[PDB]
């Protein structure tokens, strides 16, 4: 037999409430939601709406099911269609350099789709803003919600949008007949995080009943191998999950009943 052993979580993930929201956020005030303690289908996200971008830097859409993560993070905002490229690792410009920067080692998916139908207004939608000027670049996942006037000259400037200084925020403006490059686009960045802690988010792979004293194919919280598992009088810190040695996985921690089981080939 083969065993795959996942935590006993019985909650679905709040993904349909991040994509089907009414008013998304501005790229400078991009919203973040935490996803923890839930089983994620990732099926109502691969087929939710006709998508312009579903680029999964890092893990691959075939593999997210049967992977377990510690925390998932759904970032949400709305940018211009030309700027969906800038939501990617290692990119330069305005949106990535001053509004929303991703790390060179990013892991997760970037989804992006057209919202001209419900984010554009004939009179003009001035509810969405972007930061044009910042005194410095952004680190991965930083956020500058400031609204202070910025001066580029040696002369001071405070509380007035006079010459040599300029307000930092700029309104997009979304009229239904804008070019497709300049039309609204809603972006949801799913970012997955593995850490030295229990796995809270896990794909819908049903846990199997545990079997020791036999040579099985094991899959614990996603980490896979082969061998026989035997009850282990070893013990490591709580919130620790594996027994790397000399980098094999000597021992594992059972997600459901936190017993340490040693792996031997």
């Amino acid at each position, epitope marked *: 037999e083969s065993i795959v052993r996942f935590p006993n979580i019985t909650n679905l993930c709040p993904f349909h409430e991040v994509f089907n929201a009414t008013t998304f956020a501005s790229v400078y005030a991009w919203n973040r939601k935490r996803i923890s303690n839930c089983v994620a289908d990732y099926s109502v996200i691969y087929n939710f709406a*006709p998508f*312009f971008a579903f680029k999964c830097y890092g893990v691959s859409p075939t593999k997210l099911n049967d992977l377990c993560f510690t925390n998932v993070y759904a970032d949400s905002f709305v940018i211009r*269609g*030309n*700027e*969906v*490229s800038q939501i990617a690792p290692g990119q330069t410009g305005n949106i990535a350099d001053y509004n929303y920067k991703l790390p060179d080692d990013f892991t997760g998916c970037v989804i992006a789709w*057209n919202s*001209n*139908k419900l984010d*554009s207004k*004939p009179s003009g939608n001035y509810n969405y803003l972007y930061r044009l000027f910042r005194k410095s670049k952004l680190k991965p996942f930083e956020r500058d919600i400031s609204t202070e006037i910025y001066q580029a000259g040696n002369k001071p400037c405070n509380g007035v949008a006079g010459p040599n200084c300029y307000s930092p925020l700029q309104s997009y*403006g979304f*009229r*239904p*007949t*804008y*070019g*497709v*490059g*300049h*039309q609204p*686009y809603r972006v949801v960045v799913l970012s997955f995080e593995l850490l030295h802690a229990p796995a809270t988010v896990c794909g819908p792979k049903k846990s199997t009943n545990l079997v020791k004293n036999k040579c099985v194919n094991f899959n614990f919280n996603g980490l896979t191998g082969t061998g026989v598992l035997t009850e282990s009088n070893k013990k490591f810190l709580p919130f620790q999950q594996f027994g790397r040695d000399i980098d094999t996985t000597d021992a594992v921690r059972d997600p459901q009943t936190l017993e340490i089981l040693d792996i031997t080939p």
Partner: antibody
Amino acid sequence: VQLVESGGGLVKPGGSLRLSCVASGFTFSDYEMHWVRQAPGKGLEWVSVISESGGTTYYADSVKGRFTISRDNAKNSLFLQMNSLRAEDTAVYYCTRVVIVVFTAMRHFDYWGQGVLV
Amino acid sequence: DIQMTQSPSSLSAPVGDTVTITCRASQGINSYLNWFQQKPGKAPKLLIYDASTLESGVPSRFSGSGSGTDFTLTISSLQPEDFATYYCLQYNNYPFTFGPGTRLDIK
């Protein structure tokens, strides 16, 4: 002001083609370029649009995933790559333009192309 | 998925008459609609944009006037060059949609 389409012809099912549409007379870097096809004795069908920079692209509900629009502003050319074709995709293809004043799309499909059949 | 439908399907009026062709949209296309002319075999041309405005060089006898969902295109003087197929385009949001078309024939 000319948009000369210089590709297409015969091809088999499951084929693979790349139509070209070379512009002349206008600043190509300031026009959204669309492909639209009309079947023999049938109504026009909008298929694809590419932006003045090449960033944003939009496809129909029939050519999605099968087609790939592109453009090169140094050679002043627009390209449409068709794959996984069918016998129903037989039509005359036209390259049309839309002007963007600053962000608004003005005067859709002003000058069309001669058309090439596939 | 904005489905556009024109009326009537077939059309025929002798030289020197008023002719009306209507185009209807499922949702509201506001003032976003274009009218095109196509002789059999040649590339189409542009007749009115923003549902009301003519171009430089178009015949000044083509009247277009409408808003909301129902848009109307009329003419008052038929000429031998007006016997083509006319099309209505919505450009409110992608994907765009052309209509079926109206065939304005000689009597």
